[PDB]
């Protein structure tokens, strides 16, 4: 786990010294913009059920075989649909955490590190999750800076899967 605030401390610590004027500026900037991320996280959280369920149905529409083909990797059973909606909710929750954290740290630590091994082992297509993320981007209803901050993390996840 790192964020600009903890990287400022890590830099000072690596040199055995107290925080510098430049490191105090990291804190000024963080507190100047932190509320934007808190508000965007809260807005997404409040719409999580609609966004996750809508994203799952968007994936099933683009990839109809995922609800028809038999296999442990597919959403052709109630159990498979539940795994899929669960995973999409994980992605949305990670986006809210990044908004609260002021960086990618939560998504890096909890989701991206190891994702390629998971998807390979369990035969899950990264392209399925890309469509879920693009549905969320198109449907969160955030404006302006809030939209850019949320979209930055949705796009970061797409990139990690692409």
């Amino acid at each position: 786990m790192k964020t600009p605030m903890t990287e400022a401390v890590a830099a000072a610590d690596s040199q055995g010294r107290f925080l510098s004027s430049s490191e105090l500026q990291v804190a000024f900037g963080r507190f100047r913009q932190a509320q934007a991320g808190l508000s965007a996280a809260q807005a997404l959280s409040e719409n999580a059920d609609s966004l996750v369920d809508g994203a799952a149905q968007a994936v099933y529409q683009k990839f109809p075989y995922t609800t028809q083909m038999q296999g442990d990797n597919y959403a052709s059973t109630p159990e498979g649909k539940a795994k899929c909606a669960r995973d999409i909710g994980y992605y949305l929750r990670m986006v809210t955490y990044c908004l609260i954290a002021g960086g990618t740290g939560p998504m890096d630590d909890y989701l991206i590190a190891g994702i390629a091994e998971i998807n390979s082992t369990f035969e899950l297509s990264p392209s399925w999750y890309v469509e879920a993320l693009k549905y969320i981007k198109a449907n969160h209803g955030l404006s302006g800076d809030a939209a850019v901050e949320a979209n930055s993390y949705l796009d970061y996840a797409v990139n990690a899967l692409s």
Partner: protein
């Protein structure tokens, strides 16, 4: 390393939960106190050498056995190491009040410090007393009404006290 924000995130992830409105509200209050927090970091950092020296002087006055010949802070090398440790702990306290979480101080300073001091024969009760003397001085300096926009910093002083108290507990 956590900051106040990633600490909340980490506790929420372990429960599979979105951060709640109450938690968002608490983080918003931390954000709205951000100038005051940076004043605390700045005031302690700017006065670090006198906080260490004055706390050390007071420690040795109260614990004369440390500086008697044969004592753990006797010889220039041991005195210098003791003053270094006081500065190290103050430095990690400033990191904790900067980030709004004590994890930096647990992970990089305090974890295993009890055991290190046992192996060396460093008396942790006296380290704890030095830490608590730095606490008193740091609060007096950080919460001084002179030369600052007037307002309440009581929440930050409680949080700051908590980091010093955490270090004091960890060394014994």
């Amino acid at each position: 390393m956590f900051d106040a924000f990633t600490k909340v995130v980490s506790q929420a992830d372990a429960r599979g939960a979105y951060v709640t409105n109450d938690q968002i509200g608490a983080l918003n209050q931390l954000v709205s106190d951000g100038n005051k927090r940076i004043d605390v970091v700045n005031r302690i950092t700017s006065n670090a050498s006198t906080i260490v020296a004055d706390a050390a002087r007071s420690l040795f006055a109260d614990q004369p056995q440390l500086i008697a010949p044969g004592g753990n802070a006797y010889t220039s090398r041991r005195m210098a190491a003791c003053l270094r440790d006081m500065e190290i702990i103050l430095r990690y306290v400033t990191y904790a009040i900067f980030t709004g979480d004590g994890s930096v101080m647990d992970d990089r300073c305090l974890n295993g410090l009890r055991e290190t001091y046992v192996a060396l024969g460093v008396p942790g009760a006296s380290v704890a007393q030095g830490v608590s003397k730095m606490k008193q001085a740091a609060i007096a300096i950080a919460n001084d009404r002179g030369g600052i926009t007037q307002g309440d910093c009581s929440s930050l002083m409680s949080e700051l006290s908590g980091y010093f108290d955490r270090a004091a507990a960890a060394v014994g």
